[PDB]
Amino acid sequence: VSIKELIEKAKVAQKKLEAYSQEQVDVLVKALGKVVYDNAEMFAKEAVEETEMGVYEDKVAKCHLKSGAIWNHIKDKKTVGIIKEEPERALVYVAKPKGVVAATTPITNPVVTPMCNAMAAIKGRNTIIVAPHPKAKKVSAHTVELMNAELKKLGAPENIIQIVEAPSREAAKELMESADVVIATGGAGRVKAAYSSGRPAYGVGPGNSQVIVDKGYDYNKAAQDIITGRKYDNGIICSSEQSVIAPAEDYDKVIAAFVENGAFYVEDEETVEKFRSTLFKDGKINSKIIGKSVQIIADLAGVKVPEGTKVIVLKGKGAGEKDVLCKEKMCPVLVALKYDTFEEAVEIAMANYMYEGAGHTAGIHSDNDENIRYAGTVLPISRLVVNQPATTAGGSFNNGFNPTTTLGCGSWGRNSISENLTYEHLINVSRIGYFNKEAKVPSYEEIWG
Amino acid sequence: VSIKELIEKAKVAQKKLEAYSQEQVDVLVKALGKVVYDNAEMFAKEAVEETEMGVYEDKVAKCHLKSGAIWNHIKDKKTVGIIKEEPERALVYVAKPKGVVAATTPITNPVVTPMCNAMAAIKGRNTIIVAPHPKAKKVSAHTVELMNAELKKLGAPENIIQIVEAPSREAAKELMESADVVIATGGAGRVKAAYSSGRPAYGVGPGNSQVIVDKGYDYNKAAQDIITGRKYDNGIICSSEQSVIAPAEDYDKVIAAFVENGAFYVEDEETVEKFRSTLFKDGKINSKIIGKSVQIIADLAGVKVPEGTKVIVLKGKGAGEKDVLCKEKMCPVLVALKYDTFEEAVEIAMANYMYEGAGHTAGIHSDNDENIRYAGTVLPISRLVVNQPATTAGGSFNNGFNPTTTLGCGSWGRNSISENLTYEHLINVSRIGYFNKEAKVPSYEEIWG
Ligand SMILES: NC(=O)c1ccc[n+]([C@@H]2O[C@H](COP(=O)([O-])OP(=O)(O)OC[C@H]3O[C@@H](n4cnc5c(N)ncnc54)[C@H](OP(=O)(O)O)[C@@H]3O)[C@@H](O)[C@H]2O)c1
Ligand SMILES: NC(=O)c1ccc[n+]([C@@H]2O[C@H](COP(=O)([O-])OP(=O)(O)OC[C@H]3O[C@@H](n4cnc5c(N)ncnc54)[C@H](OP(=O)(O)O)[C@@H]3O)[C@@H](O)[C@H]2O)c1
C-alpha cells in the first residue's frame, strides 16, 4: 500500500496498456463513463451523505451529463500513434502517452472527477492513481471500484486505475513527485503543491463567477438561468454564479425578476449583515454552510426566509474588498451590485476577480454582441458563458465548451492552461519533420521588408 | 534593484502594454529580432569571448537565422483580443497575456534565447525579466540593452524587458516564484527549479540526438548533414547530432563517407579511450572541452588529428550504459555504432535515450517512409528530423518545426510541452461560449449507442 508500490503497479499496467490500439482504449473509456451514468443514483446519494453537501437530484444530473458529454466528445478523437498528416508543412504528428497520471480529486465532485480524469488518461494509453479528498474517499473509492469491475470484464490490464486511501501529505507529495504528470482538482493549496512537485502539472483555481445582466435583456430568462446555476448542488460548483451585476436604471426590475423566480432579496443593511456574519468568519467562508440549503443558512443567520426560496440575494456594500460577500460563496447566496455603464459593470467584475477567482468563469446575459465581445476581450477569465447558466462552463449539449470536471484557470489561477482539461493534455504530440527541398533562401528584403 | 522591485516595474509595464493593439506589438517584436540580425557580428564575437565556447561564424549564422525565422513565423499570427470565430461550435476565441514572464537563459545561446523569449512574450502583450547564466551575463545584458533602445525609439513603455544583474540563489528562485509564467532554457537543474516554483513553467530538457543512417541511403549526403549539425557552434546545440547508428553491412562505406567529408574516425580501442578519458571525468562531461575545437580535444587527448578535421568519430563499445560516449557530448565528437536490422537500430537509439536525453530530438537519414514512421512512433522524442541536419529541429526555412530557442522535451524530459516554444505558450486563450438552441436533449441510445 506504499506509493512506490502503486507507482510500480501503474508503470507495469501502463506498458501493457501502451500496446492497445485506438479502438481498444475507446472500448474501455466508453465503459468507464457508462458505469457512472448507469449508477448515477447510488453514487449521488452516497456523495451527498458522505460529504454532507450538495443536492441528490443535482448530483444525479451531474453524473448523467458529465459521463455522456465527455464520451460523446472524445469518442472520435485520435490519440494513438500517428494522428495527423500535414503535407503543407511536411509534418506528421504522433500521439504518445505521458505515462502515469497522479490525480487529486475534490470533495465537491468526488464521483465525476475520478471518472473524467480516468477517461482522459486511458484514452491516451496513460494509467492513473487517484488520491481523493479525505471527506469523500469512500464514494471516490467506490467509483474506482465499479470502474475497475467493468475494466476486468473487458480484459483490461490490471491496475490501470488505482486509488490511495490514506491522504498522508507525505504520501500525496511523494505521489505527485513520482508520477509523470499531475492533475490537481481542488483548493488553492493542492494546486500549488502540484506546481511545486517538479513534474508537469494541470491544476484548477477557485471560482468566483461574476455575472453581468445587460440593459434591455429579458430579465426573466436571465434570473431563471442565474438561479439555476447558483442553486445547483447547493452552489458548490466552481463555475457557479456568485454575483448579479445589474443596471441601476432597471435595478428594481431585475430584482423583481429574481423574486418572481424564487429568490429572496435582502436590501436592509442590518439584515444583510446577519447573513454576512454567518457566511464568513474572519474573512473566510464558514465551512458549516458550504453546500447547505437556503433554510440552513437562514436559520443560522436568524432571518426568516419564505418556504420555497431557491437563492438568497444580498445587496452588497460595494465591489471588491468593500464587501466580503464579493468573495466566492459555495452556497446558494448571491451578492447584488449596481452599474451605470457596461464599462462600470466590467470594472466591478474585475475588482471581484482580483479579490478572488481570477482566471475562471464569467456569465453574461445580453443581446448586445459588442458588449459580450468587450467583456470577453478584457475580463480575466478563461470562459465567458452567454445567456445560459454559468454551470454549463464545464460542458453542455448546447454550447461548445469541452466537457470536463477540471476547469483550468490560466496564469491568473496559477495554472498551465486557460481551458477545460481533456484527453489532449495527457498525451505527448511528436512531430516527424520532413525536408522540403523546393524552397529557396529568402533574402534580407523578403524577411525584414 | 531587488527582484520584488523588478516584478513591480514589470507589472506596471505590462498594464501599459496590455492596451497595445496587434499592429503595435508587431512593430516592437519585429524590431527586437532585427536588432539582433543587424548586430549579429558584434554579438557573436562577444559571446565567443565571454562564454569561451562556440564558433564565431556559427553564432553569426545563428543570430541571422533565428531572428529572421522567428519574425517570419509570427509576423501574421493573431495574438491580441478576439483571434478566431468558430460558429460551428458557437465559440469565439480571445487571446490574453499571461503577465510577467521569468526567463532563465543559457550559456550556449546567450543572445538568441533572450531575443526569442522577449519576442514571444511581447507578441502576446507580456513583459519579461531575463535571468542570464553567470558565464554569459555581459553579452546577454548587452542584447537586452540594445533591444530596449529599439523599444524606446518606437515609443514603447519602459521596462517591458528587464534583466537580473545578479546570478542565482534566492534571487532567481524568488523571480520564478513571483512571476506569472516561467521559461527555463538550460540544464536539468534550471528545469527542475522551474517546475518546483509553484508557477506555470516551460522547460527544455538535456538533448542527446540519436541518428540512424538507413540502409541504401545516400551516405555522402547523410554524412554531410550529420557533420554539419554535429560541428555547429562546436557542438553546443541541444539538438546536435550525437551518434551515428550505421548498418553493419555497409559500415565501412558510411565511415568512408564521413572521412570523405572531414571526419577523423577512430577504431582502435586504446586510442578511443584517450578521447573518452578526456571527454568524460567520473561519468560527467569535462567542462574544459565543452564547445571547444577538435584540435583542443585532440591535444588534451594526446592524439594527432589532421588539420582541417571537422568532427571526431569514435567507435563505441556498445549501446546505452556500455559506453559513457553514448551520453550527450557538447563538443564536435560522435559515437559510432552498428546494427543488423532497422528494428535493432531503433532499439540502440532507444537505449541511448534511456541513458540521457529522452524526449528531445532524433535524426534519421532514409528513403523508406515505413522505417521513418516506425522510428518516429517508437522513439521517446518530441521531434524526428529527416534527411537534414538535426540542428534544424529548432526551425529552418526548409522544414515545418516552429522556430525557437526553447525546445521542450515533453513529459520524458519533465517538461510541460513536447514541442518548440512559441508566442502561443505565453498567451491565455479564452472562449466565449454562446447558447445553441437548435440542439435537442439526446436520448440514452443517442448517448451510449
Ligand atoms: N476549477 C475546477 O474545475 C474546480 C473543481 C472543483 C473545485 N474547484 C475549486 O476548489 C475549491 C474546492 O476544493 P474542495 O471543495 O476540494 O475543498 P478545498 O477548497 O480543497 O479545501 C479543502 C480543505 O482541506 C484541505 N485539504 C484539501 N485536500 C486535502 C487532502 N488531500 N488531504 C488533506 N487536507 C486536504 C485544504 O487545505 P490545502 O489548502 O492544503 O488544500 C483545505 O483546508 C473551490 O474553491 C472550488 O471552486 C475547482
Ligand atoms: N532544449 C533546449 O532548447 C536547450 C537549450 C539550451 C540548452 N539546453 C540543454 O542545456 C544543457 C546546457 O545548459 P547550459 O549550457 O546553459 O549549462 P547548464 O547545464 O544550464 O548549467 C551548467 C552548470 O552551471 C550551474 N549554474 C550555476 N549558476 C547557474 C545559474 N544562475 N543558471 C544556470 N546554471 C547555473 C548549473 O547548476 P544547476 O544544476 O543548478 O543548473 C550547472 O551545474 C545542455 O544539456 C543542452 O542540451 C537545451
Residue numbers in the entry:
A (entry chain B), B (entry chain A): 5 to 453
Quote the authors verbatim.
Succinyl-CoA reductase (SucD) is an acylating aldehyde reductase that catalyzes the NADPH-dependent reduction of succinyl-CoA to succinic semialdehyde (SSA). In Clostridium kluyverii and other Clostridia species, succinyl-CoA reductase operates in fatty acid fermentation, allowing for the co-assimilation of ethanol and succinate. In these fermentations, succinate is first activated to succinyl-CoA, which is then reduced to SSA by SucD before being further converted into 4-hydroxybutyrate. The reaction mechanism of SucD supposedly follows the canonical reaction mechanism of acylating aldehyde dehydrogenases. In these enzymes, the respective acyl-CoA enters the active site, where the acyl moiety is transferred onto an active site cysteine, leading to a covalent acyl-cysteine intermediate.
Our structures at a resolution between 2.1 and 2.2 Å (re-)confirm catalytically active residues and residues necessary for the coordination and binding of mesaconyl-C1-CoA. The freed CoA moiety is protonated by a nearby histidine before exiting the active site, while the acyl moiety is reduced to the aldehyde by NADPH.
